[PDB]
Design a protein around this ligand. Structure first.
Ligand code: NAG
Lengths: 56, 161, 53
């Protein structure tokens, strides 16, 4: 969906800034880990798929 | 989604007992002293600052953004010369906004060759709502309000592209 | 007044005292109604003593 992932906080709202930073970093961590693991596993699956086609 | 810069207080009619020609050196245009275009600096006319009282009722079927300000003279002499009263107030009364501002006079570090700051406040007025401005000094009154309809909540980008 | 020149942020603490009874305020500060104004470029507040048992 349409989103803007950037927010601005003043100098008396650092708890909010750290909460937003935690949200952003957690989303980045989840997406990075999932994307890398997914790419590795699907590369293995694709190579096995081609191997199975040749053997069949 | 739709932005309209309109007159909330036309300078011609609205203020008959105030000079409303105040200009600032820091806000300079083409070498001449100037001020903001959406706000007007009020000052005592004929040596008096009469008790102000203004009301605006929203009828635009849209949200109205209103800006104003409060002036803090650097020394008590500036306040005496400008508004002729040592202690003043600014009351902004809405159905969901309500505040009183009191000038705080203090010697402050010089920025843009000025000694006393002015604070800027804003509010959003719902359709069918009324906002009341009252004061006897230090009011930087609104000139143009902004009727707007909020759209997808986006943000801003700091860039040189 | 204090002007910051440390090339660093300066944390400043202070307090406002509320005497329990009006007698304590009279004995201490000799005035029934007082105030504390703290004025900064981005901080500005006025504090008024609230005397209560
Ligand atoms: C200006 O002063 C006159 C009386 O001298 C008064 O009737 C009028 O309401 C005042 N206008 C404003 C905007 O305060």
């Amino acid at each position: 969906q349409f989103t803007a992932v950037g927010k601005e906080f003043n100098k008396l709202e650092r708890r909010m800034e750290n909460l937003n930073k935690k949200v952003d970093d957690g989303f980045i961590d989840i997406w990075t880990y999932n994307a890398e693991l997914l790419v590795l596993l699907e590369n293995e699956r694709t190579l096995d798929f081609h191997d199975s086609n040749v053997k069949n | 989604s739709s932005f309209e810069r309109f007159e909330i207080f036309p300078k011609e009619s609205s203020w008959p007992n105030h000079t409303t020609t105040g200009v600032s050196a820091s806000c300079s245009h083409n070498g001449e002293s100037s001020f903001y275009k959406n706000l007007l600096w009020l000052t005592g006319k004929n040596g008096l600052y009469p008790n102000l009282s203004k009301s605006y009722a929203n009828n635009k079927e849209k949200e109205v953004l209103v800006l104003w300000g409060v002036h803090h003279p650097p020394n008590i002499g500036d306040q005496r010369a400008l508004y002729h009263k040592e202690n003043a107030y600014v009351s902004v009364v809405s159905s969901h906004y309500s505040r009183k501002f009191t000038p705080e006079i203090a010697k402050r570090p010089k920025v843009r060759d000025q000694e006393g700051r002015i604070n800027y406040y804003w509010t959003l007025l719902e359709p069918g709502d009324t906002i009341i401005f009252e004061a006897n000094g230090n009011l930087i009154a609104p000139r143009y309000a902004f009727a707007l309809s909020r759209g997808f909540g986006s943000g801003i980008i700091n860039s040189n592209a």
